[PDB]
Every structure is written in C-alpha cells, then in structure tokens.
Design a protein around this ligand. Structure first.
Ligand SMILES: OC[C@H]1O[C@@H](O[C@@H]2[C@H](O)[C@@H](O)[C@H](O[C@H]3[C@H](O)[C@@H](O)[C@@H](O)O[C@@H]3CO)O[C@@H]2CO)[C@H](O)[C@@H](O)[C@H]1O
Ligand SMILES: OC[C@H]1O[C@@H](O[C@@H]2[C@H](O)[C@@H](O)[C@H](O[C@H]3[C@H](O)[C@@H](O)[C@@H](O)O[C@@H]3CO)O[C@@H]2CO)[C@H](O)[C@@H](O)[C@H]1O
Ligand SMILES: *[C@@H]1O[C@H](CO)[C@@H](O[C@@H]2O[C@H](CO)[C@@H](O)[C@H](O)[C@H]2NC(C)=O)[C@H](O)[C@H]1NC(C)=O
Ligand SMILES: *[C@@H]1O[C@H](CO)[C@@H](O[C@@H]2O[C@H](CO)[C@@H](O)[C@H](O)[C@H]2NC(C)=O)[C@H](O)[C@H]1NC(C)=O
Ligand SMILES: *[C@@H]1O[C@H](CO)[C@@H](O)[C@H](O)[C@H]1NC(C)=O
Ligand SMILES: *[C@@H]1O[C@H](CO)[C@@H](O)[C@H](O)[C@H]1NC(C)=O
Ligand SMILES: *[C@@H]1O[C@H](CO)[C@@H](O)[C@H](O)[C@H]1NC(C)=O
Ligand SMILES: *[C@@H]1O[C@H](CO)[C@@H](O)[C@H](O)[C@H]1NC(C)=O
Ligand SMILES: *[C@H]1O[C@H](CO)[C@@H](O)[C@H](O)[C@@H]1O
Ligand SMILES: *[C@H]1O[C@H](CO)[C@@H](O)[C@H](O)[C@@H]1O
Lengths: 542, 542
C-alpha cells in the first residue's frame, strides 16, 4: 500500500480502529433460499383507495428502492478504500455528532449485496439506486486509482441485473474524500481543484459503467450536502477567507460547476459512442411550501424564499433560466460566486432528468419579526429563508394542527404529506422542466420509536410506514393519469435499516429490518415491503 | 363507630401525603367557550372504507366514551372519600408497582367534568360510561355513608344529561375500600361479609340514581380484577388458607355472588317502582382466540381453555347454563368454591345485557410441552390455560407474522385485531345470549411512544389510534348489518389520557391529550377524537 493512504487511516483510527464485520466474504445465495412467510392476507386490507383501481404506471416505470454507498456498505477499509470525512467525523466525535455509531459495518451490504438483491427480487422491485464510494475509486480522492474499488461495483452491477434490478447510479452521496478536505478544503476550495478532481473521478466511473448504467445523477441532495459544510469536520479546515456561513454557498457554486463539467463529459462520452446513451441530472429535495395563512403576502414570500434556497439555488441554474433565483443573490451577495460565462455553458441545460426526494411538503410562516428585518441579519435564527424554521411552525397550521402525520421525532423534518405530492410535481415540472421527465427519487418513513421494539413481530407490522408508501405511490399514480406528469419512477428510501448519518443505526427507514444484534445482520421483511411489492403487482405492466 | 377515616388515610400517607391539584373547585363553562380549531379537512380519509357505506347503527345506539373513577377523577381525599387499595399501593410501592405515579390528582376530572362534557358534546358524543368510587359512598366500605359522595355524582349525572350524554354506570371498577381489605380481606373473604357489604353499597347507588341511570354494569372485567388479587396489596393480608392462586378463584366466586345478589336487589327496586326500569350486566373482556395452526386439535383445545378461563368462568354462570366451564371445573375446582343452587338462583340469568371490552383477539398456541402435562402442574408457567401465553406466541402465527399492528410495548397485550371482531361477536352472542343485546363496552389504543413526544402538533395527529378506532367501529357497523348482531353501543377507552393502573399517566389512551405538565391539565383534541366524531355523523341516527 501507499503510505499516504496508511497515514490517513492511522489518523482516522487514532481514537478507535475500524471494526470488521462478522463475515467478510462475498456471500453466495443458495438456489433454495427460503424467504420468511407472507403476512396475513388481511394485513394489506384497505390501504389502497378505490380511486386508483386499474390504473397502471407507464410502461418502463422504474419501481425501485434507494441506498447510498456509505450508508449501506460497511467494509470501510476493505480492498483499498480510503477514508471519508464521515469515517473521520464518527471515529473522533462519535459521542456528540454520530449518536455513538459509525459507518464501519452498517448493514454490510458490501459483502451481502447478492442476498439483498435476491430478497429484493422476491418483492418485484425492478430498479436499484446506489451511490459510488468515491474513496473506493480514488482512495486519496485524486491520484492513483484503486482497481479493486472499480471491480467491486462491476460485480455489484452484474448481480443486480441478474436479479431483475436495473441499476441507477449516483456519483457522489456525501462521502467526501478526507484527503481532499485536508489538502485544500474540498468543496470549500476557493480555487477550482475540487472540480478538476471530481470530474476525473466522474469520467472514470462513467467510462467504466456507462455501458451498463443508463440513468445517472451527479450529486445526491446538494442543498442538504452543502448545508452540512457549515459543520464539523469541514469547519476544522476552511480555506482563508471562508466563514462557516459561506462554506454553504461556496460549496453551492463549486457543486454547480462540478455537475456542469461532468454532464459535458457524460454527453461527450455518449456522443462519441463510448458508452450507451442515457440521462443525467441530480436529485433535488425539500419543496415549495404552502403559506400558513393562504393569500397572505408574507407567508407567500417566505414560501418563495424557501423554494429558492432549498430547490431553486441548484435547480434554476440547471433546469431553468441558468442563474440563481433572484431572492438568493440579493440576500447573500458576494458569499455566492457569480456565474462566469463559461460556467453557464456547462450548467444551464446540464440536466436530462429532474429528480425530487419528495419526502414531504412543509408550511411556511413568515418570520414574526418581519422578513425584511430578518433577511438583513445573518445572525437571525431564521436567516436566510426568513420563515419560522422551527418545528412548531414548519409543520403546523394557525389552527394548531399539523399538515399531516409526524414520524419519529428524531427525524422531525419528516411528515406524511401525500395530498400535496401532485401539486409539487406540477410546480417542479413546469418550473424546472427536463426533457427526460421527473423521478420520485426518495421517499420513506421512520416509524416512531421502532428502534425500541425488542420483539420481531412488533417490528414487522409497521402500519405508519406501510401507509405512507401507499399514500405516496397513490398520489404518484394520479399525477400520471390525472395531471399528465412525465413521471419516470418511484424509489423508496430505503430497502434496509441502515446508517442514517448523524442518527446512526438508531433511526430505521427500511422496509426490511436489519438485526443489528446478529453477527450475520440477518434480514427479515416488514409489512411495508409487502405493501410495496403488492402495489407493484397491482399497478405495473407485465 | 366514627370517621376513623383518618387512621386509614394516615396509613396511606405514611410515606408521602396525598397531593392536592391546582384546581379544587367546580369549574364553570362559559357559554362562549371556544374550542381549538378543527384539523385539516383533508384528514380522516382512507379510514372509512367503501364497504361500510350507507350503513347506520340502530336508533338509540350508545355512541360514547368510557372512564373509571380512580383513573380520571383524582380528588383522592376530597369531600370525605375513603382510601382504596390503590391509594395504599401507590403511596407505598410507587417505585415498583405504580411507575412512580399515584391517582391522587390524575386528570382532575372530579372538578373539571362540566368542561369535559361540553367538549364531548362538541364532538357529538351521546353516552358517558363511568364508575363510582365505592369509597366515596362508604369511605370505610361499610358503615357510615358519605352524603357528599352521593351528592357529587348527582351533579355529574345532571351535567352529563345536560350535555346530551346518556349516563351509563359501573358500580365497581377495582377501587376496593382499603378498610375492608384490612378488616376481613377483600374478595378473599372466606365468609360472606364482602357480599353483604357490596350489596349494601350497590343498593345505595341504585336508589339514588336509578331514575337517571338506566344501563348498569356491576363489575368491570372481573377476570382481570380477580387476577389482580393475586398481587399486592391483596397478598399482604390473605386470610389463609388462601395462597396467591387460591386468591384469584375465591375472588371469582365472591364476585359472582356479589354480582348475583346485587342484580336481584336491582330487580326488586325496579319491580317495586323505586327506580326507573333499566338493564344490568357486567363487562367481560379478552377473547376466544384463533388457533395458531387451523384444524390442529391441540391449538383448538388451548383456545377453548383460554376462553373458559378468561370469559366462560364468569359468563357461563351468568348468561349460560349457570355453572363453570367444564374445563375450568376439571382444572381448578379444588380452589374454586362450588356455586350452590341458591347461588345459581341469583347468578343464572343475572345479565339483561352483555358487554365485551373487545380490545383484541389473541392467537392460541398449545403448550409446547403438551397441554396434558401443563394442566397437571400448577407450577408450569402456562398453567391453567396451557397455551403458550408469552408475547412471541400469543400474537404470532407459525409464519412468524403478527395477527395485527402492535401498540405501545408497555401495553403489549394490545393489538389491532379488527378483522376478528365480527367472529368474536357471533361467538359471544350465541354462547352467552342476553335479552338486551351486547355492548362493545371498551376498546382503544395506546399509541406507541406518544408519551415521549414533546410538541403538541406531534401528539395530536395520532394516525394509528385514529385507524384503530375507525377499523373497529367499521366492523361493529358491519356486525349489525351482515351478521344481525344485536349490538347496543360502542364506547371508546378513553376520552382523556388517564391513569393507567401500574403504568400511571405514562400510557396514553385518550382521544384527547391531557397536558399533565400544566396546572390546569388543559385538554386538546387528537385526530382520533374527530375521527370518532366524524364516524358518528356518518353512521349515527341522532
Ligand atoms: O434519513 C435522513 C434523511 O435526512 C434528510 O435531510 C433532512 C432534510 O431533508 C434537510 O433539509 C435537512 O437539512 C438540515 C441539515 O441536515 C442539518 O445538518 C442542519 O445544518 O440543518 C439543515 C436545515 O437547516 O436535514 C434533514 C435531516 O437532518 C434527507 O432529506 C433525506 O434524504 C434523508 O437522508
Ligand atoms: O391498562 C391497559 C388495559 O389493561 C387491560 O388489562 C390487560 C389485559 O386485558 C389483562 O388480561 C391482563 O391481566 C394480567 C394481569 O394484569 C396481571 O396481574 C397478571 O395476572 O397477568 C394477567 C394476564 O394473564 O392485564 C393487562 C394489563 O396489565 C385492561 O383490561 C384494560 O381495561 C386496560 O386498562
Ligand atoms: C463546526 O461544526 C460544528 C458541529 O457540526 C458546529 O457545532 C454546532 O455548534 C452550535 C453552536 O454552539 C451548536 O448550537 C450546535 O448544536 C452544534 N451542532 C451539532 C449538533 O453538531 C459548530 O458551530 C461549527 N463551528 C463553527 C466554526 O462555528
Ligand atoms: C436478533 O438476533 C438475536 C441473536 O441471534 C436474537 O436473539 C436470539 O433469538 C433466538 C431465536 O431463535 C434465540 O434462540 C436466542 O436464544 C436469542 N439469543 C439470545 C440473545 O439469547 C434476536 O431474537 C433477534 N431479534 C430479532 C428481532 O429477530
Ligand atoms: C405477592 O405479590 C407480588 C406482586 O404484587 C408478587 O411479586 C408476589 O409474587 C406475590 N406472590 C407471593 C408469592 O407473595
Ligand atoms: C396453593 O394451594 C393450593 C391448594 O389451595 C396448592 O395445591 C398449591 O400448591 C399452593 N401453592 C402455593 C404455595 O403457592
Ligand atoms: C412442573 O414444571 C416445572 C417447571 O415449571 C418443572 O421444572 C417441574 O419439573 C414440573 N414438574 C413435573 C413433574 O411436571
Ligand atoms: C403543556 O403546557 C406547557 C405549559 O403551558 C407547555 O410548555 C407545553 O408545550 C404543553 N405541552 C404540549 C406538548 O402541548
Ligand atoms: C474477511 O476478512 C476477515 C478478517 O477478519 C478474514 O478473517 C476472512 O477470512 C475474510 O478474508
Ligand atoms: C374553581 O373555582 C375557582 C374560584 O374559586 C376558579 O378560579 C377555578 O377556575 C375553578 O372554577
């Protein structure tokens, strides 16, 4: 091994070493694998509305699940991988930033992916969304390439297709190479090295997999990702001139450039015939919130500010007119870099497909101390949106009632807001049109206190997750038939309980349970998985 | 004699005294009382299915709520009340038996009943089920009567009727006078003084209220109650030869005798014209489970034994042939006093109406070591039912999936088993026929971890309780029209988060939240409260 690689992992493991999973050997799926038995036939009763009878998704609709490399894989040091910022963060600040978990092992999907795909095939899933661990490809972020890393995902893509699973690839899902952060501040780079290094990485994976993967996303939820750059460990290494309030908007600019340059490479690769033709975008999230008091110009202004800061700041340069929303530039000023002419050439139109992580719709209350007062105070707790961002407002009507069912309070951003899906999709497809249509790239549930159950039968009958997915899929189906949305697919987060960033393995978003108390991390289907399978059975073509 | 109440309350308050609520006056309800606003109109959908469309409950159907004196009243020492066994227990074993709560104050419904009823009227409730604290009437259980106690419930009954709530009265809901337990044991009385004392007590309340209260239950869930007499504080004072076990079955007989004698008096009072004619029974609970493996003779046997020990042991003497179930006679008997013919003369036919606290339906797995070996070993953990009684069996098919959604793990006995309700009602009304029909006398939900929520909007959108109540009401509604069941009403446990026995105020059963972190214990409506209200509008007569 290369010494700089060893130094980085020594650094990360200075307080505690990377833990090694029970089993570390590509598992083999016996042809006689026995799935656990189906739930009672009555369990799925009355989840569906009669309003969707006979309706089918379009031919080719992507009906699938989502995971992310660092969230499901484990094998943090296997086969030459280098450390990311999250390996460092959680090996150094586990008790204050990571709920005493780390991503060393997670669900062990790095070694168990063949079994997972077999279990996904049993439910009729037809699409598998995954992310590439950058550090499996470039262990130092730049420089030498790790052939074992490229080869792992070769094997991953082939088994999935073997199990009927169309692979959909995200190049970057938040697992920043630690090395690039130390060298020059990674996404806070005041220069352009992060773009050069990212495009090289993207070129390699495009060349290696572009013949097999025909739907690509550059970045997963860049607004959420860049907002993290205001925190540890990014703020141990800010470049000179960089604050922790602008680490988010310098990241915004660097990310928009990385996306544009990468899409050009992807399109050049297609136009040269090197890889099969496909579609590329990035996954947006959040929403265009409803005013707390309808018709009130203040609530509408804070709703617009929210859309612009949570969606427009990335989607308007790419799928709209090619510039930032006007409200963002005016409030942030010189913290947000201006788009040079060359930048707009790459960024504007650099999205074949729109993708929305449509977990929910919020409610926007204008700041009680005034939006005009708030936008002028970077120290205001509601800056820069200048709505009331705290939970007792963002989810609550003046009536005091919530917009909808709340999920686990540790993921209090999450609510069941199915009635609003069709409105978001009309807004997104009219404002950020993409020639390839729109994906529902991530929706899912954290059932309240599911981590405190100790007996499996209590876990597997997961009613509120099971009806979220049904509510959401139903509105998705009506968006196609009643609204003509060019909806390309529905991907649920996630297929297994996994490592949910700062919340670790405590928070359960899976429709399969993962027995952390089992060295084998053995798997078992929840009711919500069978509801997902059946909705597929009723509303997919075959 | 005297009012040696002081000796008794000093005993109870020996470790710490009874706490006094912040409000100890009768509240007055302003005519302009403003209710909190309704939830979004787009709520309540997908609960009511298409299958119960156009169906109505019978004219006069009691569509109401249930509470109990020691669970909602508080005022444990107000206006002359004597102590109950639960006052003693929770002031002495708070940390080990009462989850560090006591019923001193509870929801303070003793003083807030006018506001509670005004709020119930706002939802269109027409029936209010309540119990009388025996110790408010006879503070020493027998002897001197507390006129203030009798007069309090006069004011409650008159106010309830004023708010459109037909009052339904339960004579005894587990609050045994401590004095009677100490004097000669409670229901473990080897003589017959407890029957005399109860009958004297029942007569007083029948005379005072029978012109206003026309539906009566003697005992709430006596099988559950008598099983409590195997625990503290009852087992500090058994009058030998009564050992634990020999405590549950002496109680069953004394209660059956108490029930039969009290019902006879009730009938003499009606027949003499002293009180308006009404109906009287008792509230059964539990269920006749389903065999884990259908057609298996062992699972069918343990299911039958379960019904017999949980329903038949009280219901067969009262509504059936007048004797214990044969399987009960065969296993116990040497612990169970024989029902004399004079006993049978009072007990047989002493139920004008049946009532089932139909929380759930269980699954019966025959004991893994054989029923025959379990029944002959009083020390087997599965004696005397000799099914597998533990949670991983009682709720689980051999397939490993649950019978239905589980509730809060501290009330793990509770599951949503709506699909089996109709099957339960046919068995009960064909096996234990009553001329007045059958009441669904309690059902309700303990929403998982609702006690851990910190923000009101998260508490009030209670999706699975809303679901539970609509699912059950829908099956009740289908039971009348498809099965012709003479179902007389539906009463939900409960209208407010109350004091659940040993769990104290931690467990949340209300369709209104009671902010126990208030000096006023302010009530706020949950979604299930409006769901209960909405179902009434859609399916009641009025
Ligand atoms: O399963 C995890 C879940 O996380 C979700 O992110 C949530 C919101 O979508 C996102 O807007 C919000 O943004 C936070 C950021 O994470 C915090 O670090 C902090 O800086 O404040 C921001 C808001 O100002 O984060 C939420 C979770 O914390 C993802 O959307 C979802 O895909 C899942 O990954
Ligand atoms: O408070 C919630 C709910 O509790 C219900 O009682 C539960 C079961 O119905 C009942 O069968 C069970 O009986 C227990 C008993 O409490 C124990 O002391 C011991 O004897 O084991 C028995 C089971 O074999 O108790 C359950 C709650 O503890 C009530 O019926 C209902 O009204 C509610 O109060
Ligand atoms: C560096 O990032 C850290 C941690 O991610 C920020 O830590 C937060 O600090 C604020 C201010 O005290 C606390 O209120 C937060 O609760 C901390 N967040 C959590 C939970 O991690 C820290 O402020 C950032 N440092 C700088 C440069 O400001
Ligand atoms: C998660 O795995 C643990 C460990 O394997 C399980 O605990 C064991 O359960 C088996 C059931 O066959 C028992 O035979 C063992 O005795 C248990 N081990 C212990 C700790 O005593 C646990 O049941 C699993 N949890 C779930 C939800 O499946
Ligand atoms: C007496 O009661 C307590 C619970 O109240 C119980 O633990 C104990 O086992 C009971 N029986 C005996 C043996 O006294
Ligand atoms: C209780 O007494 C019965 C007889 O009434 C006896 O058979 C049983 O073994 C005793 N058990 C104890 C000591 O709990
Ligand atoms: C009775 O059951 C106990 C366990 O509950 C067992 O240990 C004891 O040996 C049994 N006695 C017989 C002979 O069944
Ligand atoms: C209960 O009331 C207290 C004080 O008024 C308040 O702080 C708290 O938010 C209330 N509880 C809820 C969750 O509504
Ligand atoms: C995976 O890695 C482990 C290291 O603990 C080995 O023991 C195993 O043989 C496999 O190579
Ligand atoms: C009891 O009466 C007092 C006044 O004596 C009130 O303040 C209270 O609200 C309740 O009505």
């Amino acid at each position: 091994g290369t010494a700089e690689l060893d130094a980085l992992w020594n650094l990360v493991e200075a307080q505690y070493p990377v833990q090694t999973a029970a089993v570390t050997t590509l598992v083999t799926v016996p042809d006689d694998y026995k799935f656990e038995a189906d739930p009672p036939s009555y369990a799925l009763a009355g989840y569906e509305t009669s309003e969707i009878a006979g309706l089918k998704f379009p031919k080719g609709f992507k009906f699938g699940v989502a995971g992310a490399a660092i969230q499901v894989e484990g094998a943090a040091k296997a086969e030459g991988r280098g450390p990311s910022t999250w390996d460092y963060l959680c090996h150094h600040y586990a008790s204050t930033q990571c709920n005493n978990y780390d991503p060393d092992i997670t669900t062990n999907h790095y070694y168990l992916y063949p079994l997972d795909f077999a279990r996904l095939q049993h439910l009729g899933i037809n699409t598998y969304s995954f992310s590439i661990s950058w550090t499996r490809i470039y262990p130092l972020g730049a420089g030498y390439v790790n052939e074992a890393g490229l080869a792992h995902y070769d094997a991953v893509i082939h088994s999935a297709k073997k199990y009927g699973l169309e692979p959909v690839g995200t190049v970057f899902h938040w697992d920043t190479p630690l090395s690039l952060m130390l060298k020059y501040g990674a996404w806070q780079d005041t220069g352009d090295q992060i773009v050069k290094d990212f495009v090289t990485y993207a070129t390699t994976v495009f060349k290696r997999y572009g013949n097999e993967v025909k739907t690509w996303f550059t970045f997963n939820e860049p607004r959420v990702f860049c907002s993290q750059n205001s925190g540890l460990p990014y703020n141990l290494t800010y470049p000179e001139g960089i604050n922790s309030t602008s680490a988010v908007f310098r990241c915004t600019y660097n990310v928009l450039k990385a996306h544009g340059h990468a899409v050009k490479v992807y399109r050049d690769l297609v136009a040269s015939g090197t890889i099969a033709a496909g579609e590329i975008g990035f996954k947006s999230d959040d929403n265009y919130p409803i005013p707390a008091r309808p018709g009130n110009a203040d609530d509408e202004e804070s709703a617009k500010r929210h859309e612009a800061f949570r969606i427009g700041i990335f989607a308007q340069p790419v799928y709209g007119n090619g510039d930032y929303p006007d409200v963002v530039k005016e409030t942030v000023g010189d913290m947000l870099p201006a788009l040079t002419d060359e930048d707009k050439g790459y960024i504007k139109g650099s999205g074949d497909i729109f993708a929305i992580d449509g977990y929910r719709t919020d409610i926007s209350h204008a700041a009680l101390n005034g939006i005009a007062n708030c936008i002028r105070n970077q120290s205001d707790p509601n800056w820069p949106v200048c709505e009331e961002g705290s939970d007792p407002f963002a989810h609550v009507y003046p009536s005091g009632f919530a917009i909808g069912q709340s999920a686990d309070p540790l993921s209090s951003w999450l609510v069941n807001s199915a009635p609003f899906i069709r409105d978001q999709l009309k807004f997104l497809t009219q404002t950020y049109p993409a020639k390839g249509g729109i994906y529902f790239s991530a929706f899912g549930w954290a059932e309240d206190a599911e981590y405190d159950r100790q007996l499996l039968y209590q876990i597997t009958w997961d009613g509120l997750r099971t009806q979220y997915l049904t509510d959401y899929l139903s509105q998705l189906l009506l968006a196609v038939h009643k609204d003509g949305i060019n909806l390309r697919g529905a991907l649920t987060w996630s297929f297994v309980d996994n490592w949910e960033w700062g919340l670790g393995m405590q928070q359960k978003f899976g429709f399969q349970f993962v027995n952390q108390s089992d060295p084998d991390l053995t798997r078992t289907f929840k009711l919500s998985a069978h509801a997902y399978a059946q909705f597929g059975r009723n509303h997919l073509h075959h």
